Design a protein around this ligand. Sequence first.
Ligand code: CLA
Ligand code: CLA
Ligand code: CLA
Ligand code: CLA
Ligand code: CLA
Ligand code: ZEX
Ligand code: BCR
Ligand code: PQN
Lengths: 74, 154, 38, 175, 169, 741
Amino acid sequence: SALYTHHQYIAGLLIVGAFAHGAIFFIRDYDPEQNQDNVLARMLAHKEAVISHLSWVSLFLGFHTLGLYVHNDV
Amino acid sequence: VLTPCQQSEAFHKREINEVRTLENRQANYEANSPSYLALQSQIDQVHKRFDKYGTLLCGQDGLPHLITDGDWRHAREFTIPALLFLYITGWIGWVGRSYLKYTKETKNPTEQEIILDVPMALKYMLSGFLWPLSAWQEYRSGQLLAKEDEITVS
Amino acid sequence: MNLKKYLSTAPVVATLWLFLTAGILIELNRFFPDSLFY
Amino acid sequence: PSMPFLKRPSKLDGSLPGGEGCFDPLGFTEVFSLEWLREAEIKHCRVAMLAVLGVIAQEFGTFDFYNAKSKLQLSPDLHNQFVQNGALQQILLFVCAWEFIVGLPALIESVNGNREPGYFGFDPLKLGGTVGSAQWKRMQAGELRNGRLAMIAFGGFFHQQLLTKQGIIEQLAHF
Amino acid sequence: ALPFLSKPPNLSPDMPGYRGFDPLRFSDAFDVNWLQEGEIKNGRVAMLACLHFFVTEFYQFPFFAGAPKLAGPAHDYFVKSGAMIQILAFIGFLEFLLHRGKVLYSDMEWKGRKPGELGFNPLNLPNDKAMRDREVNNGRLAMLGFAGIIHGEFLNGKMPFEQITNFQP
Amino acid sequence: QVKVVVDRDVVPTSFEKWAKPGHFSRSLAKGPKTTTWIWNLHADAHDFDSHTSSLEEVSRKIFSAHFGQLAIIFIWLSGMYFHGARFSNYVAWLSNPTGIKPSAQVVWPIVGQQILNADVGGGMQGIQITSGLFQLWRASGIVNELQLYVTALGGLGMAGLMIFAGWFHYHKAAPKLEWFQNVESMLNHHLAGLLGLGSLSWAGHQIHVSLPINKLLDAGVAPSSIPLPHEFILNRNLMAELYPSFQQGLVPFFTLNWKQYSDILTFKGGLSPVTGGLWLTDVAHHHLAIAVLFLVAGHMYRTNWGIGHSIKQILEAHKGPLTGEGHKGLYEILTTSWHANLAINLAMLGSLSIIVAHHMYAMPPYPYLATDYPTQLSLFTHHMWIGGFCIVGAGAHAAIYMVRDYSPTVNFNNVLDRMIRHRDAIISHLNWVCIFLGMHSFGLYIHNDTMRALGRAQDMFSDTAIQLQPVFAQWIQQIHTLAPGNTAVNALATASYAFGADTVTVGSKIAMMPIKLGTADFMVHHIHAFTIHVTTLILLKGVLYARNSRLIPDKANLGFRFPCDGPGRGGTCQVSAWDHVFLGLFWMYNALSIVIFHFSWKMQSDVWGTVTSNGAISHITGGNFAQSAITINGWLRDFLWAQASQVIQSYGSSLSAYGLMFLGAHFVWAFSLMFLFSGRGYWQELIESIVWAHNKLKVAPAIAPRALSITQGRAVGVAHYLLGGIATTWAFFLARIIAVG
Ligand code: CLA
Ligand code: CLA
Ligand code: CLA
Ligand code: CLA
Ligand code: CLA
Ligand SMILES: CC1=C(/C=C/C(C)=C/C=C/C(C)=C/C=C/C=C(C)/C=C/C=C(C)/C=C/C2=C[C@H](C)[C@H](O)CC2(C)C)C(C)(C)C[C@@H](O)C1
Ligand SMILES: CC1=C(/C=C/C(C)=C/C=C/C(C)=C/C=C/C=C(C)/C=C/C=C(C)/C=C/C2=C(C)CCCC2(C)C)C(C)(C)CCC1
Ligand SMILES: CC1=C(C/C=C(\C)CCC[C@H](C)CCC[C@H](C)CCCC(C)C)C(=O)c2ccccc2C1=O
């Protein structure tokens, strides 16, 4: 029970680092001219749909764990 | 293994335990107390509660589980209120979209949203009843969607 | 005369609709309580 | 003063059918705009005339099959006989059909000032139902006086309970 | 028409069935012609629906039900038997062709001067004359009488018919 | 001079401006182009010194609004009297109060929640009262349901008089400002007329209602043989049996032979040993002392008759040398700025409510109040919490004075701004006292925490270890033991049984036990002095740095609810005089959370519980304070782990609604943190990234969906941190003490 929780908190730390250097990549390392309509430029293009749908599935689960847990708890 | 719930042991253990446990308060009152009649109604609402969960699946926990596969034997469990629900907030969503594309073309769209025009509101509240084949036929005209709206830098 | 405009605003009609559908849920859960089927 | 009283000369009223005058000693018409109050006066006096004729008619012996009276107030013999009968519900509910449905907007007509707040039409009488000036106003004051006397008279027909405990006719049968 | 000066609503007097009566001013906010169409349609299907409560007598019982004069769980007797789903298929597949715009407040097809569609009228003795008014009165009467039959089936449950002769609670 | 000039037909009373939301603010009558107009509509609903600078129109608005507040209070008390009438078991509670738990609210039977109807006795169930209404009704002498119905209907009658009064005093008779700045008359009628005739007339109610009734109920008469309070005034004969000084009439009063009134009035103190409340002879005598004393107090303000003071000639006369000008200006500050008056009255009102809590736990003034411990707890706790919040309202509205209504011409070299000349020396020494008390109030707990954790319990701060016996509190408590023979000469018992003699028990329930204060109670008092000094630091830093700091030297040019200045000066987030009040609400939650965590655990260890045969003792935790309050593991374990166990196992029973308002209040507490930590620079284009998903489906809302502003996006974090944080201790406390007491 120490190894599991150990590698899990290290696991979540390292995902959050991968995304944080994602944002460091898009700020201090990204050139949208060698990436002329590239796959990354395509990613920055339709990013509104990506954030709208992560916000959608997050809004679906958070009314349907907390919906079901407050239902079961009541 | 999901046993059928009408014959599971721990289910009927919860029947005896909750009818008896709630029944323990029922001997605290006389034969014509209003509370005693209320717990008569409550004991009725427990035996009905456990007879009306007969065709469910309570496993070893004695608690009625559900199944969301669309097995068509569990359709009254999940998929019938699923399609029912999707009809209800497809109603609500098509009402709200239809009312916003009303007030988008009015005099002052700001004052339209504080003070709802209950004439035109209750027009769209009731008219948005058949949103699959009305929203679908407004989709086939290429009008449910849009194109070239706002966006950031790229 | 202009009271019906106040009874057409956002919070008042919000209460006269969520009060109403709230009464749909409660009056539909007194008549048919413990409704997990269908 | 314009009042036939101590002194408050025509605070707001005087042309209304108070033929002996405008009474109003306490500041209600001062701040209530008087049309609401005129509808309250007239509606209370109508329902009080029905109240006092109800008490008299019930004291003159009419029951299909019910409880005997011995009084016409004090709920669990008379008033809460019919509520637990499930009987006075609808005779309230049609009053709900009169008041919420065809009396509440009429009161709205008795706010904007186009009502003369009696006047639910209602003259089913030939040879005497003058809608005009003389008989309409001198009869509206008569409805008003007999209605007010019904209000105090129904007060007296209620509160003869403590040293009475009996009917009003049997109050007349003792002094 | 209603005497206490309550008559400037959104209505019109040339409308059929007009007698000047809306104290709760439902004519406002609810599209008076669509309300007229709802009164006509509620009157006609209520009119047929209480005509069924007159033809619960021995005529036309063809081999399928055999259980007349129930009017309560008769709804359960024919929901349970099936094909009332199919009578929603009958009304649904008619009514698509009746109105052809078929949406409640959105796009009411005000074309033919009147809430009456295509003239479903093979007999065709009157046109849209003041016969419409005596359709409206025989519609409203057949609404409230329909309700009285059903609540008579509710608390008494005895007879839709023989409450008329000498039977009283 | 004193004269009442009243405008008539001020404002027409149509519903026209209800159709114009934000009619009142010309800064906000533009209409919502964004959703921030929605919340600014409510944030400017009562900024009365932001509608118009004209103090006449403002003063009409507020003075009419008070009648709306009193209308809601009379609807509230009429609600409590009706829920006492129709729904409560108060008539059955009046028979045996120590057995029947008080309940009014009878939960409607929907799915499950009919199990909340606790069978508390009286033959009729419902959820149990903790507000203690039945004790105030037994004290007030309400016998049967009829006075509860009638007093409820009079509550609606006064509610109608306050709605009609407020409408009448904004619209069709509203006064001038010269009525309002006539403040010697206002004190002259509130000291004398309000409080004087209030306490005098209440002495009338207690002598002619409560003393016969709570003499009969003290004698144990059933609530049918008790005559009405009606019948004690038709004849003195039913009271001369009970109190034989009524036979003499008012004749010994007018001859000043007040020795004769020892039956009606006395000075005994202590508690009634039968009912567990104060002697209503002492309480009625007490309200006479407030009566004559306040009617003396009212007549020191010259109004028309040239007899009395004015506040100007008082404040000028204290021209002290170390202040220079003296109190010159404060009569012009407090009669032209409302927010300063709200600062003073919320400070003294809140501290009065705290005083109310401390005087109710130790001198329980209602009969059978200290018997049922939840009503004893939650009337300490509730009045402690509003008694907290009103002090932050003082710390806010003092700053709202200092930002808006400060004017250096009237306010030049007086007692006020000479503080602000050395506000560095104010706030710096509050900073020192906060650090010194934090070390010496909480470092002692880390000390005992380590020494108990390091095994060396010889080095703790217990009674066995290095003791910290509170010397001063034990000494003056020993003086309060020696009061009623020595100094309170005509007394019999002490001021309380939190001070002196052996305990008072009613129905084998400990009403009040003498509280012992040794070496753990000490350190919790230094918690309280510490967290009081921190709120005083944030709420004096919020006022002395309100108008012009040395960080930001134009805050009055920015306002009161401004969020910040910018990232300049290395970041100036959260710097306004409002933002200190934002902080003082969290420290309000801290300070009162450990006040009631001192209360509800010292008095579950040292006072409350039962008594057994031969007068033997039994507390609820069983003396488990001084060996356990000294640490934090003893505090968290032995209090928050152990006292939670009756909130947590509360399912399947009538205490399960506290088991829902416990977890849901943990949810609201945890839900505040989302608003506190993040900010609208995230949420605004998170939201706008959702606005793309509405613009794609043409569901663009016409009011533009902004995020919250900054000050709203932290005010809501306060108002959830406190709602969830307070409702956790609410559900924990009532589910703790209802489950036993
Ligand atoms: C208890 C703590 C708590 C809770 C419940 C949430 C919940 C959520 N956060 Mg979150 N958050 C928190 C703490 C919390 N956070 C903290 C501490 C941080 C660090 C500051 C963040 C940082 C953060 C970020 C950065 C983001 C979120 C987002 C979200 C949402 C995810 C979508 C979803 O599940 O919606 C489901 C909805 C809910 C779970 C809401 C709860 C249900 C409510 C209570 C019912 C509705 C009201 C109810 C009827 C009561 C009425 C009240 C009465 C006055 C009438 C969700 C609302 C994201 C978002 O916006 O997604 C769309 C997002 O981008 N959060
Ligand atoms: C006009 C009504 C309306 C409609 C059709 C939609 C439709 C949509 N919203 Mg939504 N939304 C609405 C109102 C509406 N919203 C309101 C009022 C709010 C503020 C609370 C939000 C907040 C919101 C968020 C935060 C998110 C969406 C998202 C979405 C999309 C995914 C579906 C979903 O989970 O909804 C979400 C539904 C809710 C959050 C709750 C429903 C909102 C209210 C309670 C019901 C709306 C009815 C409306 C008020 C009726 C008014 C008109 C009537 C009086 C005439 C979808 C396009 C998501 C997205 O981008 O996915 C791609 C997303 O992340 N919406
Ligand atoms: C002796 C007379 C008297 C009395 C009893 C009061 C009492 C009160 N004043 Mg008040 N006041 C007075 C004189 C008086 N005032 C004078 C002379 C002035 C002008 C200098 C003011 C100016 C003033 C302001 C500016 C405010 C008050 C407020 C209040 C209320 C505080 C809330 C409270 O304690 O609730 C307890 C409630 C009660 C005890 C109920 C009291 C009701 C009884 C019947 C006494 C009321 C008699 C009434 C004043 C007579 C009006 C005469 C008119 C009818 C002809 C309280 C009702 C505050 C408030 O809330 O506004 C209303 C407030 O903001 N007063
Ligand atoms: C549990 C978390 C926590 C802690 C410990 C503190 C502690 C403190 N806050 Mg605080 N605060 C907190 C949460 C906390 N806050 C939160 C959540 C808010 C949100 C609103 C605030 C808001 C706030 C404001 C607004 C202010 C403070 C201030 C202060 C200081 C008060 C002076 C004092 O007590 O000094 C004594 C210090 C302690 C009791 C901390 C423990 C020290 C131990 C006893 C001794 C040292 C330990 C050890 C020996 C160190 C050496 C070893 C190490 C070097 C290896 C104090 C340091 C005030 C300030 O600036 O100072 C006056 C102030 O104005 N706080
Ligand atoms: C802040 C609160 C506080 C206090 C009062 C103490 C006090 C003590 N701790 Mg301690 N401790 C604390 C917090 C505290 N601790 C915390 C927070 C931790 C965990 C980090 C520990 C961990 C700890 C350990 C592990 C141990 C102690 C021990 C001790 C004891 C001996 C330490 C010693 O020699 O003092 C040193 C004292 C000084 C150097 C004196 C400086 C202060 C003087 C009095 C200021 C005077 C100024 C004066 C008033 C100016 C005005 C006059 C002038 C103008 C003329 C002593 C009782 C030891 C023990 O065995 O306990 C018996 C021990 O082993 N503590
Ligand atoms: C309430 C209470 C009463 C009931 C009271 C009321 C009066 C109930 C009666 C209501 C009547 C008015 C019902 C009327 C029914 C009329 C039928 C439905 C008409 C049918 C016409 C249809 C077939 C349409 C006809 C088209 C007419 C037209 C000629 C077109 O070209 C073509 C064509 C033929 C389609 C009692 C006392 C009687 C009985 C109690 O039990 C209950
Ligand atoms: C069961 C199974 C399976 C399946 C599985 C899979 C394979 C899945 C998939 C899935 C996956 C496997 C996924 C992954 C994940 C990953 C992640 C997690 C990623 C993300 C990323 C990050 C984190 C970051 C980001 C970024 C940015 C932001 C910018 C730049 C770019 C980048 C990318 C860097 C198989 C077939 C094998 C077989 C059988 C079994
Ligand atoms: C989540 C969050 C938001 C977003 C909060 C959104 C904007 C408000 C969500 C609740 C509102 C009330 C939803 C609006 C819905 C209307 C009530 C209509 C719904 C229909 C009925 C319920 C009436 C911020 O604006 C914010 C600002 C500053 C710091 C932190 C935060 C922050 O954490």
